[PDB]
Amino acid sequence: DKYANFSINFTMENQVHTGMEYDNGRFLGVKFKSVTFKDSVFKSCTFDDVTSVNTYFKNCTFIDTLFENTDFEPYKFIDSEFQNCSFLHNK
Amino acid sequence: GSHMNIINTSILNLRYESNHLIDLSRYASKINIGSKVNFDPIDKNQIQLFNLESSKIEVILKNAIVYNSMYENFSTSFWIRIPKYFNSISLNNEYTIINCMENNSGWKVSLNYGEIIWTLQDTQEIKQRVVFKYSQMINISDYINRWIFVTITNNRLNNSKIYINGRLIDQKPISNLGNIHASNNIMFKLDGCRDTHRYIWIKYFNLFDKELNEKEIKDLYDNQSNSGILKDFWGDYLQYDKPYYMLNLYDPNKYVDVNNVGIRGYMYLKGPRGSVMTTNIYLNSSLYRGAKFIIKKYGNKDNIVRNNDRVYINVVVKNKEYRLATNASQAGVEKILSALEIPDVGNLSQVVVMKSKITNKCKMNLQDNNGNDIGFIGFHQFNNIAKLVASNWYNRQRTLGCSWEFIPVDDGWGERPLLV
């Protein structure tokens, strides 16, 4: 029900995620299409070279996660909290 | 120029000597250290105090100096390094770090989110506060988690003044207070701090029986900043064989990176830095960015880099160390720096002279194998690529091109470095 210590590049499609905990996950090269995260926690996750289309984070808490080379803009985050989060190369 | 030694004058001079923290003043006031009071083992004057009961230092003042009076001027100076506030529960949570209060009379130093506070109280419940505020919503801060010089002066005739790095921040009236009778002991401890992870670094505490003036304050500041030993970005002693992210002061928003290794390749400045944040708590420029410099000894036991030392500079690309070097004979004064695989560096100029100065920010002056000056290491633009170079232009005097900062990963900055 919560997931940890993984790396992925495949792109789950048109999905709604609610109440998930991702401890220590790598989101490498993944292309989100119509994905929504709700009430979710990202602990020490990493997003590298991700793209997001019609994709949103709603009431989510990111902790010590890196956003490197993403397209994530502030509008894609809805009442979400960031703790200890770095943002590096934004396109 | 000469000037009068203000420190040996002080009525309390808290310092580390032999293997104890002790008072070097006439009065030899007794000093009780807590169990969990950590001393920096590279410079044991630097004291760390945690948010634990057992983390405290108690100075039992000699009766003669214990403060009880309506007229007696007194000042205080100490260096503090305050961690970035990381938790919302630190938003309105004043907590005292240095306590000299009895029955609500005395003085205390206390902190809060973004604040340093001097509080004064008389036996008639009348009080004054003077306050240093600093933001955590700032690209690069002079204050967050960096050693800052704090002076407070009190003249009973009129004002209480607070100084940060010998610079007047704030002054307030106190001639209304009456008899302030302070404590018999000074307590260094974090009192009433809700952040269970809160800690401070503190060094060179001094209590004075007069009101220090501007010049005396600046004298203190200059002398205690210990030029001749280079500092890193947080102000700790710069060390050998220790990796650092780099910052140029002409362009702080860029970080050093290399296109490719080898003499074909060059090292340049790349922007932008990006930002590190916690929702509603801080938003700063990221500091753990780019290649990493490691300083290499080219005789002292100490791992400490001193002014005029001669060193080699390593560069970390992909968890592998290469050598900083260049060909002094190449065209034009500005000599483009590269990152050569160490066993293939041969005749290339690589010996760097580290610089602290008067005073100045860190500098690097590259040299041939004959001790000739290639130039201070800065940068230059070659069709809008800001390549790291070495120019004696810098020497012969945008002189912020050669002024650098060395940033180790510090537990009080909180950022997560991107790794390979």
UniProtKB/Swiss-Prot annotation, chain A:
Expressed at high levels in very few brain areas including the striatum, midbrain and hindbrain, and in the olfactory bulb. Expressed at lower levels in cerebrum, hippocampus and cerebellum (at protein level). Mainly expressed in brain; also detected in lung, liver, kidney. It is found in: Cytoplasmic vesicle, Secretory vesicle, Synaptic vesicle membrane. Residues 54-91 are annotated as: (Microbial infection) C.botulinum neurotoxin type A-binding. Glycans are attached at residues 5, 9, 59, 84, 90. N-glycosylated. Plays a role in the control of regulated secretion in neural and endocrine cells, enhancing selectively low-frequency neurotransmission. Positively regulates vesicle fusion by maintaining the readily releasable pool of secretory vesicles. Belongs to the major facilitator superfamily. This is Synaptic vesicle glycoprotein 2C. It comes from Rattus norvegicus. The gene is Sv2c. The chain holds residues 476 to 566 of 727 of the full protein.
Swiss-Prot record, chain B:
Residues 226-418 are annotated as: C-terminus of receptor binding domain (C-RBD). Changing residue 393 to L: Nearly complete loss of toxicity, heavy chain has very strongly reduced binding to synaptosomes, binds much less GT1b. Heavy chain no longer inhibits whole-toxin uptake and toxicity. A ganglioside GT1b (d18:1(4E)) binds at residues 250, 334. It comes from the Bacteria. Changing residue 289 to E: Decreased binding of RBD to SV2C, substantial binding to neurons. Changing residue 334 to L: Strongly reduced toxicity, heavy chain has very strongly reduced binding to synaptosomes, decreased binding to gangioside GT1b. Changing residue 380 to A: Strongly reduced toxicity, heavy chain has very strongly reduced binding to synaptosomes, decrease in ganglioside GT1b binding. It is found in: Secreted; Host synapse, Host presynaptic cell membrane; Host cytoplasmic vesicle, Host secretory vesicle, Host synaptic vesicle membrane. Changing residue 414 to R: Nearly complete loss of toxicity, almost no binding of RBD to neurons. A motif (Host ganglioside-binding motif) lies at residues 391-394. Changing residue 115 to A/Q: Decreased binding of NTNHA by receptor-binding domain (RBD) at pH 7.5. Disulfide bonds join 362-402. Residues 379-380 are annotated as: Interaction with host ganglioside GT1b. Residues 5-225 are annotated as: N-terminus of receptor binding domain (N-RBD). Changing residue 380 to W: Heavy chain has very strongly reduced binding to synaptosomes, binds much less GT1b. RBD protects against neurotoxin less well than wild-type. It is a multi-pass membrane protein. Changing residue 394 to F: Nearly complete loss of toxicity, heavy chain has very strongly reduced binding to synaptosomes, binds much less GT1b. Changing residue 170 to A/N: Decreased binding of NTNHA by RBD at pH 7.5. Changing residue 86 to R: Whole toxin is non-toxic, almost no binding of RBD to neurons. Responsible for host epithelial cell transcytosis, host nerve cell targeting and translocation of botulinum neurotoxin A light chain (LC) into host cytosol. Composed of 3 subdomains; the translocation domain (TD), and N-terminus and C-terminus of the receptor-binding domain (RBD). The RBD is responsible for binding to host epithelial cells and transcytosis across them; this uses different receptors than those on nerve cells. RBD is also responsible for adherence of toxin to host nerve cell surface; HC alone prevents uptake of whole toxin by neural cells, and delays paralysis onset by 75%. Has 3 functional domains; the translocation domain (TD) and the receptor-binding domain (RBD) which is further subdivided into N- and C-terminal domains (N-RBD and C-RBD). Upon trypsin digestion the isolated TD forms channels in bilayers when the cis side is acidic/oxidizing and the trans side is pH 7.0/reducing. The RBD rotates 140 degrees around the TD in the presence of NTNHA. The 3 major domains each serve as a chaperone for the other 2 to ensure they act only in the correct host cell context. This is Botulinum neurotoxin A heavy chain. It comes from Clostridium botulinum. The lineage of its organism: Bacteria, Bacillati, Bacillota, Clostridia, Eubacteriales.
